[PDB]
Paper text:
REXO2, a homolog of prokaryotic oligoribonucleases present in humans both in mitochondria and the cytoplasm, was earlier shown to be crucial for maintaining mitochondrial homeostasis, but its function in mitochondria has not been fully elucidated. The human Orn ortholog was proposed to be REXO2, also called small fragment nuclease (Sfn). We postulate that REXO2 plays dual roles in human mitochondria, ‘scavenging’ nanoRNAs that are produced by the degradosome and clearing short RNAs that are generated by RNA processing. The protomers of the dimer adopted a typical RNase H fold of the DEDDh superfamily with a central five-stranded β-sheet with strands that were ordered 3-2-1-4-5 and strand 2 that ran antiparallel to the others.
We crystallized the full-length protein that lacked the N-terminal MTS sequence. These crystals diffracted X-rays to 3.1 Å resolution and belonged to the P 32 space group. The asymmetric unit of the crystal contained two dimers of REXO2. The active site comprised Asp47, Glu49, Asp147, Asp199 and His194 and had the typical architecture of the DEDDh superfamily. We observed only one Ca2+ ion that was coordinated by Asp47. The presence of only one ion is most likely attributable to the fact that Ca2+ ions do not support catalysis. Each dimer in the asymmetric unit interacted with one molecule of RNA that was located at the active site. Both RNA molecules comprised three nucleotides with an AUC sequence. The 3′ terminus of the RNA was located in a pocket that was formed by Glu49, His101, Cys97 and the backbone of Met50 and was shielded from the solvent. This means that the RNA could not continue in the 3′ direction; therefore, the active site could not accommodate a continuous RNA chain.
Author numbering:
A (entry chain A): 28 to 191, 193 to 221, 224 to 228
B (entry chain B): 30 to 219
The structure:
């Protein structure tokens, strides 16, 4: 029956693809991608799968030509060291994600999720196009609600969680924890604590 | 101290835009129409920018998709492109001039419906303008997707975007949409 595929299809079309990227800089015409994580959640931000957490090999030239902040940032992170000794091609990494997201999402219906992802999509559109061809053109920006919280709910902004990490996969988990804080505190309450709300 | 409160009050103004390309192939597509507008933090419009139509080389206009051909052909917009005398470089200045007197430099974000795609062409074709803007954005298409999943009943009350033929009136729908999500999806305080 289609009514079952509809319920199943309409439920997967509400899932999100959560990514966290690290790059050599902000200039898309010269900078590249060096670390990418992926992860799938449902409409209520519950982990349905954990994608890989990869480090992409990039030539020593670009890393040696990175900005002070960038060359300093990724140095203490040790990520710069791993990039050189990495053996993961971009498309080899691009495909590894594409297979993961294909076995978990319908093609062209799920949106990109994550914190400040208008830049991640900007890079994935250029460098991982087959990946983006699977995803909806829209994004779920955890920072968009951070701004709307900053102006509309400054009181509860002070209680927002604090930073914490080691892998982009963890920066995803914090970004959901960030977004989950917004649903508990600034959106309309659906649940009293002991009835539910009208 | 009181000035730092008003300084914060200005740091929370938004910069609203909406563009119309010949296509989404950023490496081979250009901007064709643009409007701009400013609001305070609580979505009240403070100043409306211009609404300009950018002349673009003719071979590309008949090389854009049948969607872009028929739709912009039906909008009357592609006709105004040839009859436009505004280039990209002067258009950027007019928009850069407008916003500089209303918003603090680099403290205000882009806002609108899927502006992540409007910013992609602004990061490339209007960098002097984008320098005045914060790197963060405010996409109403993000809380729309959040409204579907979490508040689907109230999501059905969503108004129809009035199919505006001018990008400045398109924004009026986006704000009216965003104001909706605030009223019926965000927690009220008293
Ligand atoms: Ca638009």
């Amino acid at each position: 029956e289609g009514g079952a595929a509809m319920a199943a299809g309409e439920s997967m079309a509400q899932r999100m693809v959560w990514v966290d990227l690290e790059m050599t800089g902000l200039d898309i015409e010269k900078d590249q991608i060096i670390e990418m994580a992926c992860l799938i959640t449902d409409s209520d931000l519950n982990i349905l799968a954990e994608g890989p957490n990869l480090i992409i090999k990039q030539p020593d030239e670009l890393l040696d030509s990175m900005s002070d902040w960038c060359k300093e940032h990724h140095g203490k992170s040790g990520l710069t060291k791993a990039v050189k000794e990495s053996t993961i091609t971009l498309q080899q990494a691009e495909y590894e994600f594409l297979s993961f997201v294909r076995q978990q999402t319908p093609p062209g219906l799920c949106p990109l999720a994550g914190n400040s992802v208008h830049e991640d999509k900007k890079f994935l559109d250029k460098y991982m196009p087959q990946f983006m061809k699977h995803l909806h053109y829209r994004i779920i920006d955890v920072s968009t609600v951070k701004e709307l919280c900053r102006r509309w709910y400054p009181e509860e902004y002070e209680f927002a969680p604090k930073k914490a990490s080691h892998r982009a996969l963890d920066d995803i988990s914090e970004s959901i924890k960030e977004l989950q804080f917004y649903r508990n505190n600034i959106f309309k309450k659906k649940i009293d604590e002991r009835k539910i709300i009208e």
